[PDB]
Amino acid sequence: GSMALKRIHKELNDLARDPPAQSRAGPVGDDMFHWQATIMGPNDSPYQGGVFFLTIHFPTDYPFKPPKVAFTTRIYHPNINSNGSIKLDILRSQWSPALTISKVLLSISSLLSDPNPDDPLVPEIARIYKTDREKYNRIAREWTQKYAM
């Protein structure tokens, strides 16, 4: 057993012992390095009441490199493209070994609450978030209803 496996197992124990409120994450079959996560759309955001599915791939040198995390559910957001790739600093240069998958899920939750128009993945959605928020909120809630509900 590698430190990556022991650490992924420890994290799974901790999540069953003290569950999060608006996040479920678990292995897919017997592949401990392949998780699926659900997060709720945050209350007081255009995503509220939507369920969003995420794929989590753990590296074999976890926790010294970040998990690869992508949305499967489609979503209107400046930092998440059609392929479901997430622009998020802690999934890139700001990863640290002390971070856990639950800290990642909460960080992604907050990115739904507070998008990052500067340093975007979808310039068209970034443009709209900056200039006409009500439009972004209209379209985001439109996509949540079609895809996340």
Partner 1 sequence: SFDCAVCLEVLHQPVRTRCGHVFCRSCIATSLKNNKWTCPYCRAYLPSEGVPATDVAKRMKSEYKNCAECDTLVCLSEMRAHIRTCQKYIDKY
Beta bridge partners of 26: 36
Within 10 Å of residue 22's Cβ, how many Cβ atoms? 14
Q: Is 90 in the site for partner 1 (CB under 8 A)?
A: no
CA distances from 142 to 9, 11, 17, 53, 137 (A): 38, 35, 36, 17, 8
- The piece of 4-12, 70-78, 80-88, 120-128 that touches partner 1 (CB under 8 A) is 4-12
One residue of 96, 110, 113, 145 binding partner 1 per CB under 8 A: 96
Is 98 a binding residue for partner 1 by CB under 8 A? The answer is yes
Q: What are the angstrom distances between the C-alpha of 29 and each of 10, 12, 36, 51, 138?
A: 17, 14, 10, 21, 38
Per CB under 8 A, 67 contacts partner 1 = no
The residue range among 34-42, 58-66, 123-131, 139-147 that interacts with partner 1, by the rule CB under 8 A, is 58-66
3 vs 149, which CB is nearer to partner 1? 3
Question: In angstroms, rounded to a whole number, what is the distance separating the alpha carbons of residues 113 and 115?
Answer: 6
Which stretch, 22-30, 34-42, 62-70, 76-84, contacts partner 1 (CB under 8 A)?
Answer: 62-70
Half-sphere exposure of 101 (CA within 13 A, CB side): 35
Nearer to partner 1, 10 or 146 (CB): 10
> Which among 15, 33, 80 is positioned nearest to 52, based on CA atoms?
80
Q: Which residues bind partner 1 (CB under 8 A)?
A: 1, 3, 5-7, 9-11, 13-14, 61, 63-65, 94, 96-98, 100
